[PDB]
Amino acid sequence: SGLVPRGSHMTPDFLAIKVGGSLFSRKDEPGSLDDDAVTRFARNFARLAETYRGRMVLISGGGAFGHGAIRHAFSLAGLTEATFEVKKRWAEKLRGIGVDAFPLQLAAMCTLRNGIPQLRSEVLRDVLDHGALPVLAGDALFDEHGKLWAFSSDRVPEVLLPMVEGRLRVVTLTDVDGIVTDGAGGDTILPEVDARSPEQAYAALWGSGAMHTKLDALVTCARRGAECFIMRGDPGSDLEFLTAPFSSWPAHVRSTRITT
Amino acid sequence: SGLVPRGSHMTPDFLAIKVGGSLFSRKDEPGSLDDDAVTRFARNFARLAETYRGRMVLISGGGAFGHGAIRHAFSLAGLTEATFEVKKRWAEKLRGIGVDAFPLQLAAMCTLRNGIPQLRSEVLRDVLDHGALPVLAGDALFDEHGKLWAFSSDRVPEVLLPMVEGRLRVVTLTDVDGIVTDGAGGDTILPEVDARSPEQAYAALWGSGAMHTKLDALVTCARRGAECFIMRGDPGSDLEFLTAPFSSWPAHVRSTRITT
Numbered sequence: 064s065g066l067v068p069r070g071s072h073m074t075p076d077f078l079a080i081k082v083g084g085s086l087f088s089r090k091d092e093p094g095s096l097d098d099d100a101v102t103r104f105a106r107n108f109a110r111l112a113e114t115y116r117g118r119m120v121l122i123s124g125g126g127a128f129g130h131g132a133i134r135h136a137f138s139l140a141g142l143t144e145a146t147f148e149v150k151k152r153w154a155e156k157l158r159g160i161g162v163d164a165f166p167l168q169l170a171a172m173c174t175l176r177n178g179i180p181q182l183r184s185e186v187l188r189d190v191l192d193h194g195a196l197p198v199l200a201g202d203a204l205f206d207e208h209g210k211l212w213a214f215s216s217d218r219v220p221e222v223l224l225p226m227v228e229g230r231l232r233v234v235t236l237t238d239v240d241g242i243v244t245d246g247a248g249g250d251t252i253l254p255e256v257d258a259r260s261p262e263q264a265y266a267a268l269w270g271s272g273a274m275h276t277k278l279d280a281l282v283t284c285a286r287r288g289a290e291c292f293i294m295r296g297d298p299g300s301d302l303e304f305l306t307a308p309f310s311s312w313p314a315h316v317r318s319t320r321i322t323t
Numbered sequence: 324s325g326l327v328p329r330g331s332h333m334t335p336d337f338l339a340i341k342v343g344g345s346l347f348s349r350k351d352e353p354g355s356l357d358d359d360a361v362t363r364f365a366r367n368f369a370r371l372a373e374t375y376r377g378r379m380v381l382i383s384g385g386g387a388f389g390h391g392a393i394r395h396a397f398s399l400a401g402l403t404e405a406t407f408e409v410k411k412r413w414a415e416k417l418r419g420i421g422v423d424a425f426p427l428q429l430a431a432m433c434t435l436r437n438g439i440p441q442l443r444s445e446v447l448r449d450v451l452d453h454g455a456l457p458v459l460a461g462d463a464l465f466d467e468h469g470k471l472w473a474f475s476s477d478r479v480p481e482v483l484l485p486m487v488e489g490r491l492r493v494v495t496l497t498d499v500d501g502i503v504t505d506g507a508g509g510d511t512i513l514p515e516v517d518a519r520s521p522e523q524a525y526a527a528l529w530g531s532g533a534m535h536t537k538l539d540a541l542v543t544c545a546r547r548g549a550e551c552f553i554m555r556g557d558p559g560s561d562l563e564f565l566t567a568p569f570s571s572w573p574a575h576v577r578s579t580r581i582t583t
């Protein structure tokens with residue numbers, strides 16, 4: 064294959080940034096989006112998108128829209144409509160501050176075959192090549208038998224693996240600083256996880272599901288070369304350091320980093 | 324090529340039914356959908372969809388959502404969000420009466436190259452093969468230079484031409500009985516138009532734009548074998564005759580038929 068230089072010293076070629084629904088919605092409130100949170104995140108995502116023009120996707124968690132859309136197995140089709148709404152809210156906000164943000168329906172581009180997502184549309188690569196920011200989300204995907212399955216926003220980065228050349232960095236922003244070991248309301252963050260043998264990270268989740276889906280996806284991505292992070296999102300936080308080699312990140316940043 | 328039997332005696336293999344925004348919305352009222360009209364059309368479309376299971380698409384006009392979305396050339400991106408909403412309203416209504424209706428974002432599946440729409444996603448054919456009803460609409464499409472263009476719902480049938488095997492029937496339901504000749508508020512319907520030389524139909528539109536886009540699309544489709552109709556939609560009308568060979572249609576039906 065092509066030898067790809069990789070390491071903590073290296074700059075990513077591509078950023079897949081996933082923003083958790085817990086950060087901008089409330090499950091106690093169907094389709095409450097927090098517009099202030101969306102507004103402030105959007106400003107920080109826009110700076111990333113300018114640097115990584117054509118080299119970034121933003122993936123939204125389904126939040127309140129999602130959880131109600133999966134709360135007659137064709138009834139899951141409603142999910143694609145609920146996640147489109149969230150994409151629309153991000154994209155609208157981004158375009159309002161000068162970003163060329165375009166929502167794409169993953170269900171129109173991707174199907175499942177033997178449980179593995181298959182990118183079936185060339186449009187995503189074209190949109191990136193034109194310098195636009197795809198806004199993606201979880202979705203209802205058809206499998207090879209015609210059955211719909213809820214495909215989490217956390218697994219969307221897996222879809223990029225065959226498409227992205229060079230070094231992919233995947234960042235999953237959530238409401239915790241990473242994978243915590245020793246307690247549900249517990250003890251320290253696991254800073255590093257080796258995707259080749261991540262048994263200790265899975266063991267920490269048992270100690271205290273959503274997080275299990277995240278780990279599964281980011282291990283999958285890391286086993287194909289990606290550098291992956293689970294870390295805390297905050298609408299007003301500067302994110303410029305996500306452009307930088309990991310060894311150059313500021314000292315205050317906490318995360319769980321998943322790599323091979 | 325494969326010789327395809329065709330004629331007024333023959334049954335269509337595929338139905339592309341387009342429902343005009345004038346039939347279920349009002350341009351004088353931004354995003355007024357007429358829910359009663361949607362409800363009643365949906366019942367008639369559901370009967371078609373059962374017969375043409377896996378062999379039909381429903382295409383919605385953009386109505387009030389559309390016209391406001393096209394009323395900073397990346398600002399057209401808002402169109403894809405406005406037409407997704409209309410797809411969602413049809414699909415939701417259809418699923419409520421037992422149809423496996425799934426909205427698909429044309430912009431996630433199709434791009435323009437030298438002005439010709441190019442189906443770039445295999446998902447549409449898969450959804451049909453699974454026996455589902457794609458719900459489609461007009462959209463903002465990217466061209467090969469990265470420019471967005473508003474692609475009318477009336478032109479969506481063109482996208483099906485390379486994909487559909489056998490005899491395609493395209494039916495564009497609007498607020499007039501067909502192409503009227505001799506007056507804006509004028510004289511008789513043109514019953515037949517030969518797509519090879521449709522100069523008389525274009526001349527009738529000058530006699531009294533929207534209709535020009537319809538003619539252009541249906542001539543394009545007819546020149547590749549399709550049997551096309553412009554006729555009046557009415558939410559409560561039975562549509563079962565659209566399953567039948569043209570020579571067997573009831574005598575009360577008025578239309579403009581476009582064929583080679």
Ligand SMILES: Nc1ncnc2c1ncn2[C@@H]1O[C@H](COP(=O)(O)OP(=O)(O)O)[C@@H](O)[C@H]1O
Nearest residue numbers: 083084085237238239242243267268271273274
């Ligand atoms: N070992 C663990 N480390 C960190 N978080 C955990 C762990 N086990 C369970 N969680 C839960 O996972 C949540 C993050 O996943 P989730 O609610 O799906 O986030 P998002 O909305 O950001 O997708 C945390 O709020 C936490 O309550």
Ligand SMILES: Nc1ncnc2c1ncn2[C@@H]1O[C@H](COP(=O)(O)OP(=O)(O)O)[C@@H](O)[C@H]1O
Nearest residue numbers: 343344345497498499502503527528531533534
């Ligand atoms: N020669 C013609 N024959 C029929 N309709 C015409 C003609 N010229 C212009 N029109 C206009 O085209 C309209 C249908 O196109 P449009 O408003 O785009 O319909 P839809 O909302 O159903 O797409 C008619 O209401 C009519 O007012």
